[PDB]
Amino acid sequence: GLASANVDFAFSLYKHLVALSPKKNIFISPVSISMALAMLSLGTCGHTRAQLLQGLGFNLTERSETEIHQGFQHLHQLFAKSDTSLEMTMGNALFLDGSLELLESFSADIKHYYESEVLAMNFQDWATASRQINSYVKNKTQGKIVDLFSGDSPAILVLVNYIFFKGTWTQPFDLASTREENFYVDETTVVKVPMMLQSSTISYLHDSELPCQLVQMNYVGNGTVFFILPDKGKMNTVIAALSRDTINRWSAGLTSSQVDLYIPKVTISGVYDLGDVLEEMGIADLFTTQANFSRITQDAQLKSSKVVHKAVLQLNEEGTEAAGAMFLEAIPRKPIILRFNQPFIIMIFDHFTWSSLFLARVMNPV
């Protein structure tokens, strides 16, 4: 089903991205990526469409296109408004040059399933246009995502998704306990970071099949988080093994344990060009001179010129704050001590839908 396809996409995207970005922090929102591309698929046809939907993990013989979008619609309905169940907002926008008219079916589809705003722009005045998109995203993400467009090949259509997430720990870290500690980035790199601590009953697992130890923490509401510490030098072994089956196997093994849990106060961000990642995943027609975007508009034959994702993560003693945005441009064609003081993995899930909300590879917490 949908949860599984979205999780499979999330792990593949993460895996491909980690490989191409060996030193830098990885922080992404796979649910945001899925939603943007799923909405985009509505404007595609032929091989382009087939390739995009299969790349996203949907088998078009096991499920019709309508059932995919109804599924995303439910997810957006669930994630659109913030509340205590999940303090998260998520939304889509289509920025369109004034010279272009959407096809009626596409227009209704994006509004219906994705509650997409459609906003007319003058992309010949690219400075103004990109600034307007920038402040749209800045405002939607409570100021967390700035300068989405940095300065910059113009486009005549820009699809935008954003996500803002707040999580309060069910088990907060001890305020008095926080101290500066070494964080071992790599063999030649040590940084100082505030290191949080709690001594608590926490769901813990020392994995017997993979070289890692992990905990699962809850947020107030439906959010839940896995913190996975590979044995030193074993990051790639653990990353390679991530899957639905691994999550389920970790869930079956996690036991209430007394843990002295050390996790740094993380403040990180990244910007990722997702085009080559997507091509590696088999999503390629999108970008070629034969891209089939014939359901978007008959005013031009379009192709995607660029897909970019920017995301930010903050961890503190009280909880988590995370935000993400994607754009796609188109143009004419004993207490157990567990110490997170070196590269680790973060997986944030909605426990209700089992959507992968955010995924981290924290190389440097500062």
Mark the binding-site residues for cortisol, compressed into ranges: 216, 248, 351, 354
Report which residue's Cβ sits closest to Na ion: 200
The CA–CA distances, whole Å, from 163 to 9, 33, 35, 260 equal: 18, 10, 11, 32
Name the binding residues: 216, 248, 351, 354
- Give yes or no for a contact between 130 and 136, defined as CB atoms under 8 angstroms apart: no
Report phi then psi at 280, rounded to 5.
-60, -30
Residues at the interface with Na ion (CB under 5 A): 81, 198, 200, 218
Burial pattern 157-196, b for ≥16 Cβ within 10 A else e, equals bbbbbbbbbbbebeeebeeeebeebebebeeeeeeebbbb
**Gap between the Cα atoms of 110 and 42, Å rounded:** 8
Half-sphere exposure of 12 (CA within 13 A, CB side): 19
**Choice between 54 and 218, CB closer to Na ion:** 218
- Helix-helix angle 30-41:104-114, to 10 degrees: 150
**Choice between 101 and 174, CB closer to Na ion:** 174
Least separation in angstroms between CB 196 and Na ion: 12
**Choice between 24 and 265, CB closer to Na ion:** 265
**Choice between 250 and 293, CB closer to Na ion:** 250
Least separation in angstroms between CB 30 and Na ion: 18
Least separation in angstroms between CB 174 and Na ion: 7
- Give yes or no for a contact between 7 and 247, defined as CB atoms under 8 angstroms apart: yes
DSSP for 216-254, please give it: EEEBSSSEEEEEEEEPTT-HHHHHHT-SHHHHHHHHHH-
Least separation in angstroms between CB 59 and Na ion: 28
**Gap between the Cα atoms of 133 and 148, Å rounded:** 8
**Choice between 80 and 331, CB closer to Na ion:** 80
> Terminal CA-to-CA distance of the chain, rounded, Å?
38
The CA–CA distances, whole Å, from 216 to 47, 178, 186, 202, 247 equal: 41, 20, 25, 7, 11
Q: Residue 306's beta-bridge partner residues?
A: 329
**Choice between 77 and 288, CB closer to Na ion:** 77
Tokens representing 138?
A: 């800045």
Half-sphere exposure of 364 (CA within 13 A, CB side): 15
**Choice between 80 and 308, CB closer to Na ion:** 80
Tokens representing 198?
A: 């709690």
**Choice between 198 and 342, CB closer to Na ion:** 198
